[PDB]
Write a protein that binds this DNA or RNA. Sequence first.
RNA 1: GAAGACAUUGUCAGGUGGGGAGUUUGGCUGGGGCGGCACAUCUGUUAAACGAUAACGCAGAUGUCCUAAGGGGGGCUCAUGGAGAACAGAAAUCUCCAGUAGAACAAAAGGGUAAAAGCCCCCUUGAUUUUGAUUUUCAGUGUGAAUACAAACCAUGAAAGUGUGGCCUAUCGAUCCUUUAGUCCCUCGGAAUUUGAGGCUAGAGGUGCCAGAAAAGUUACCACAGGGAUAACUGGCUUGUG
RNA 2: UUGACAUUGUGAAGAGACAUAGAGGGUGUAGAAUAAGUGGGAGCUUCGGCGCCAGUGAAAUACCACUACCUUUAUAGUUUC
RNA 3: GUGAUUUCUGCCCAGUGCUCUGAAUGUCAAAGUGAAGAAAUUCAACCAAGCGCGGGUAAACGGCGGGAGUAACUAUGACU
Lengths: 105, 49, 217, 146, 50, 66
Amino acid sequence: VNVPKTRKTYCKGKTCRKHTQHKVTQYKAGKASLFAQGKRRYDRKQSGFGGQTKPVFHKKAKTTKKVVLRLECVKCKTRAQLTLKRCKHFELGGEKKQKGQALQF
Amino acid sequence: NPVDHPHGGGNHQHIGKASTISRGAVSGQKAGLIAARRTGLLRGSQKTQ
Amino acid sequence: MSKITSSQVREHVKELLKYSNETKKRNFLETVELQVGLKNYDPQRDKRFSGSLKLPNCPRPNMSICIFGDAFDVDRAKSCGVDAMSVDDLKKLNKNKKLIKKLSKKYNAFIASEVLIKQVPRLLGPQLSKAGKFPTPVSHNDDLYGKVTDVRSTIKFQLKKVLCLAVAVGNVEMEEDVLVNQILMSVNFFVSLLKKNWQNVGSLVVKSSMGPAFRLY
Amino acid sequence: FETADAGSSATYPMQCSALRKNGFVVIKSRPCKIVDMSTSKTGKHGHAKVHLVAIDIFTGKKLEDLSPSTHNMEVPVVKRNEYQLLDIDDGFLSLMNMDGDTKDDVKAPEGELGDSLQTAFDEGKDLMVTIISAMGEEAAISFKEA
Amino acid sequence: GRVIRNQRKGAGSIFTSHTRLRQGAAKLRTLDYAERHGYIRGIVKQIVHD
Amino acid sequence: VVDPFTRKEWFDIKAPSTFENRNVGKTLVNKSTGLKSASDALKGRVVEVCLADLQGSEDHSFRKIK
RNA sequence: GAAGACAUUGUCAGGUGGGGAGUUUGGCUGGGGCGGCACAUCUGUUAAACGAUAACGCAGAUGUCCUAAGGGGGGCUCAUGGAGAACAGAAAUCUCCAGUAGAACAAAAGGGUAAAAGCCCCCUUGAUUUUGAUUUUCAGUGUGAAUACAAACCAUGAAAGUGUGGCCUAUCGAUCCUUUAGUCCCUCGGAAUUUGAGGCUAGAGGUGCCAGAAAAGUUACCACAGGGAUAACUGGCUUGUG
RNA sequence: UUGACAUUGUGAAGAGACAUAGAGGGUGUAGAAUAAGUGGGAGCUUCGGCGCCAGUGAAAUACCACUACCUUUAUAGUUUC
RNA sequence: GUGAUUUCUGCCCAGUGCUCUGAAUGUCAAAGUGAAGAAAUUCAACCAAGCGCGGGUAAACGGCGGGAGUAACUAUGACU
Ligand SMILES: C[NH+](C)c1cc(NC(=O)CNC(C)(C)C)c(O)c2c1C[C@H]1C[C@H]3[C@H]([NH+](C)C)C(O)=C(C(N)=O)C(=O)[C@@]3(O)C(O)=C1C2=O
Ligand SMILES: C[NH+](C)c1cc(NC(=O)CNC(C)(C)C)c(O)c2c1C[C@H]1C[C@H]3[C@H]([NH+](C)C)C(O)=C(C(N)=O)C(=O)[C@@]3(O)C(O)=C1C2=O
Ligand SMILES: C[NH+](C)c1cc(NC(=O)CNC(C)(C)C)c(O)c2c1C[C@H]1C[C@H]3[C@H]([NH+](C)C)C(O)=C(C(N)=O)C(=O)[C@@]3(O)C(O)=C1C2=O
Ligand SMILES: [Zn+2]
């Protein structure tokens, strides 16, 4: 699906509680740091003898992921997240479609 | 029988898997040709000549 | 982490416009050049990076553009004022090699038409693409003057065989802040097109037309 | 500056029985084309299991697989695209979309099909080539005279 | 499975060698001064079957 | 660059006193470096020469001495 | 006599390792198996004119697509047929007349819609924020979907109004773990400052066996607890077939 | 099985890599051209001329940088075989 | 592994094994090295065997299909 690079939407910041301009990006997940408490617990639990201790997911059924947009306001630099539905293809700011242009096979 | 040997089981007498065992195998697996670089009838005939 | 920030680029672009704007004021409009260079990218092995970016202002403002158009594109070119190159002299030109060489070397950017773009390989030869100049399509709805400015602004980072790339950023008399913003945007576009990003950028030079090659990184 | 890409694994999981002849299947992280299939009953109150023989298309390598017929299998979402060849450069063929002209990354196919393609382009006779795209890799598979 | 025949063979008991009718071990004369410097003369007296 | 012809040096082959030409000729061997004695590389050598060249006269042209 | 700071040996790390060890090897089902999904959903019918309602009943469909195919406003009327106009004919384009919808509304079916909900044009981002209430499945729990408001800020339009995604009915996901956004917030418990870590509020990464185990077989060498809830004889009801 | 550390002391010889600054270089056609390539570039300067235009060729000559590759020079040393 | 003697043991090294003085690190742990930081740490190169790429081996496990046209009866097809 096509979504524009810019969007006027509500800003939660205390200096601007009105509709302000936001740039639209995609949320890419973080680095999954090693010192998180669950990771340290997993390392201690996997250490030793006994093999794998927590389940590992195998039965993947869904192909798509919900896209979530990171909106950064251009004035207060505050960020927000907006969820858009399961789409296989995604283009930030692609070319706009044409109503009645000559088809080209 | 399959309990007594790697080659073992039946309904037909056959090896089942490749009879060329590794050199780096373990005990109980080395029933066959141990580190066979070549197999079959040889002709011929030099090794170091 | 962006290895290259504004502040050092502010200082280096101050000294760049210093050397251009009083020291060796010349008789023609010079252009700012970003020359970049890669380290671990092996051209024969990796996936080739390719991408064009429309600049927020203008580089070289006197590029020489040629319009392969038919009737509406040709008439729009006559209105605006760009050399329009119709199917007439194209099929009057077909029977040669030197003349297509002359056309390709004479006009630097080529602009096309949607209904011409498929038989450009046929009517012309592979020479344009081999040089690195394929005509960019222009629709009938698209305003030709606006797309001419578009093509005189677009910067192309594209690997061909080698590891040094060079792109014109802008002119030497435009204002300091837009030059800083443009060179930062072009650097970030290159880094975004890469695989390992700042890890695999290795060379970052800015220049205008002459000896002093003002390094950024 | 980033690159937008919705999370779309290039595999729909389908079924061992729903894979058919001339198929597409993922055997050990490689695309491959199902060229042979056989169902087989195991026991006496047993179920059927599927033996799959397929050819990896990007290398042309035979890969085999064995699974219970009720289990799910990854099926690559292959995309075949019909492009126009401008000129065969230094091993990396230049290719054209319907209007766009990026596609300059596909290695000129090293087989006899690509050698005959080179002979064709050398005596001109301009062609449209067919390119397959699947799980990050793309390859020219078949030339066709326009 | 089960411990197979070659493993049992290496584990001793039944698969030892029968040394009842064997003579002494067939070994050369040990190194000494006589063999290291000059020569020594022995007489082969009975050739037998091991 | 390896430049073996300046790495090497020339030596003079001389004949037993039964003959009349004392000078037989010249050879070349690598420099006497550590762990490799050029002198042992010289003792490992057999050389061929004409008896006409050894005795001066042409009556011994067919004969060859090693 | 031979080897020599190599090797052996000690400890970690990678590989290999059915030789060995544990464990698993879904459900429904006119017996079980193969097949299928009737396992999470949607439309018409069965369904017996409130609601509810079964079968491996029938006919089908879903795991998508769309920055417009969302929102507002304006102009027009759509299939089809007839009569005509160079090339031009059955059919290319243009008119006129008739035209209650016989078209279209992304997709399956049903419903709805004519100065529109259809087709073109203009502007936009209500596909936004804060939590509550209600309906459907329902235990009146969750998930999903939807309804009507409130406090804001907006869009559109002259305005009334409309708009909290798709004209309506489907298009989807808990704990634990990871990651991101918010205030400039809380804690690191002897006292402070920075990184780090843990919290609170809202999302995403996914469990399709869809209220959500991490999981291959064989056994005629078999074993146990059971079952006529369940098959292979006979009997019984029925007689398509004979 | 492979690697590291320890047992484990005492010495050589030869190679390779890294380490920063220079210098120099890259001749099949054709082009008068000694064309490693990419990019800007119609001006350039030493005031002679060069460059564009022309021609030529797979690509062009001024002004220019950058890129790798190769060769050595300075090269405290570190490190591996 | 096959199973006296006689006779013979055809073709296939794609798969799975097995093997190598084949080739370059493509991937590659711990320890060691360098950069940043106030450090915890993070990121780099270098990176053993192995895996991957290449070759050999079937008295290793094993495998050994189709479809057309084609000869004075027709029919089959030595042949293509
Ligand atoms: C001189 N070369 C041929 C050699 C010879 C021997 N052994 C002998 O002298 C005896 N072998 C003969 C008699 C010549 C057949 C050698 O024993 C060796 C080597 C070479 C080195 C190479 C080392 C190198 N490392 C430093 C990166 C390398 O390229 C590898 C590698 N990954 O292939 C090595 O393994 C290496 O470390 C190495 O082990 C070598 C030798 O041991
Ligand atoms: C497995 N190692 C111990 C080994 C052994 C032998 N030869 C033997 O069998 C040893 N037998 C002897 C000791 C000579 C009697 C070997 O002969 C080799 C090698 C190593 C390979 C490694 C190759 C390698 N890549 C391509 C996998 C590599 O990167 C290099 C390199 N450029 O450093 C190589 O040296 C390699 O290509 C290579 O040549 C090897 C051997 O020759
Ligand atoms: C055939 N031999 C001469 C050899 C040559 C090379 N070098 C090459 O092949 C280089 N040639 C190229 C250009 C890379 C293709 C080699 O690289 C090698 C080897 C063999 C082994 C030697 C091994 C030896 N081990 C068995 C005791 C050894 O001394 C060591 C060691 N302690 O360093 C090894 O690790 C060794 O296994 C080894 O690495 C070898 C090679 O890789
Ligand atoms: Zn704001």
